[PDB]
Amino acid sequence: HWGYGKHNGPEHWHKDFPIAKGERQSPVDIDTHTAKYDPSLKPLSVSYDQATSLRILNNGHAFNVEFDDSQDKAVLKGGPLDGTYRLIQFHFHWGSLDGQGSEHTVDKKKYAAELHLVHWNTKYGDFGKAVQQPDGLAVLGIFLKVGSAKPGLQKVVDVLDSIKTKGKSADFTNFDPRGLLPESLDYWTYPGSLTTPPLLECVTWIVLKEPISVSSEQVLKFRKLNFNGEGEPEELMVDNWRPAQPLKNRQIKASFK
Ligand SMILES: NS(=O)(=O)c1ccc(-n2cc(CNC(=S)Nc3ccc(-c4c5ccc(=O)cc-5oc5cc(O)ccc45)c(C(=O)O)c3)nn2)cc1
Ligand SMILES: [Zn+2]
């Protein structure tokens, strides 16, 4: 039903998902001058050494690299978080042009794409329960800008031809998500939501200040994916991003001065 077209895009979502106009919606613009340094915020703990990737899926909205989340194998802790959050999947949002594609913006700047590493709070037992809680998920967001290639992204780029259309999946074992991280773990954080329907207000957002660089050839391959299923009219999977939503009664905190 919902998507990113003129007739089913972000401006329409509220009709089926009234929380779209809620009090803690994502993404948002990060006004860097208004964000306040919070000296009490802990360093982020990204522990991905035991990660078990399984599969890559074109779900018609993006592609997800899925992980075994039946044990503490790849976890996010520290920062603004209380407890342990398990990595379940990552995906990206990207544009049709290098000048757009990110969901979060920084002083109104749009990046070419944005990576979301999605984690759920163990305390809640599984992902489905976690999305029903205001602190159920932690999403680590990383901006992508076009420049030098990201070597750790290439394995993802090269499998995309095998999942061109909605509903296609491929084996995707032994992928190391540490190869997608920038050098610095400096971040902004705020309480928000899923950025796609059902738009549930269950996410602690942690957005890294340092973007990663990917090559023009790498993002061009993202843009060859299809929203449609096999044997349907081709619609390129591009501009699968929700624009910035009102900040309302929220403060964005910075881990760094
Ligand atoms: N871009 S992003 O922000 O990083 C992002 C965006 C979307 C997802 N995403 C979206 C999905 C789709 N799967 C979902 S939403 N699962 C799910 C799980 C539980 C419920 C749910 C219930 C499920 C079963 C049930 O018996 C009762 C339920 O009661 C609820 C009450 C709530 O307040 C909220 C959610 C539920 C629902 C849902 O119905 O929305 C959907 N999976 N991952 C992940 C990350
Ligand atoms: Zn996302």
List the determination method: X-ray
Annotated binding-site residue? 33: no
Protein residue whose Cα sits closest to atom 38 of ligand 1: 198
Given resolution (angstroms): 1.3
Determine the Cα–Cα distance for residues 220 and 237; give it in Å rounded to an integer.
11
Q: 25 with 103: CB under 8 angstroms?
A: no
Question: Do residues 111 and 164 touch, judged by C-beta distance below 8 A?
Answer: no
Asked, as a colleague might, if the bond just before 39 is cis with ω within 30 of 0, I would say no
Q: What is the 3-state secondary structure (H, E, C) of 171-226?
A: ECCCCCHHHHCCCCCCEEEEEECCCCCCCCCCEEEEEECCCEEECHHHHHHHCCCE
| Best of 87, 118, 131 for a ligand 1 pocket test (most atoms within 8 Å of beta carbon) | 131
- For ligand 2, a single-atom ion, the residues with CB < 5 A are 116
- Catalytic residue, chosen from 33, 61, 104, 119, is 61
Name the pairing type of β-strands 105-106 and 29-30. parallel
What is each CA distance from 106 to 30, 56, 184, 216, 217, in whole angstroms?
5, 29, 17, 21, 25
Domains identified in the chain and CATH numbers:
1-257 (3.10.200.10)
Q: Compute how many other C-beta atoms are within 10 angstroms of the C-beta atom of residue 47.
A: 16
Ligand 1 pocket mutation pick from 132, 204, 240, 245 by most atoms within 8 angstroms of CB: 132
Q: Is 51 exposed, middle or buried (0-12, 13-18, 19+ CB in 10 A)?
A: middle
Instruction: Output the CA–CA distances (angstroms, integers) from residue 101 to 50, 144, 171, in the order listed.
Output: 31, 9, 27
Q: Is the CB of 195 under 6 A from ligand 1?
A: yes
Residue of 108, 143, 159 whose CA lies nearest to 213: 143
Query: What is the distance between the alpha carbons of residues 56 and 45, in angstroms, rounded to a whole number?
Result: 25
Nearest ligand 1 atom, CA 62 = 1
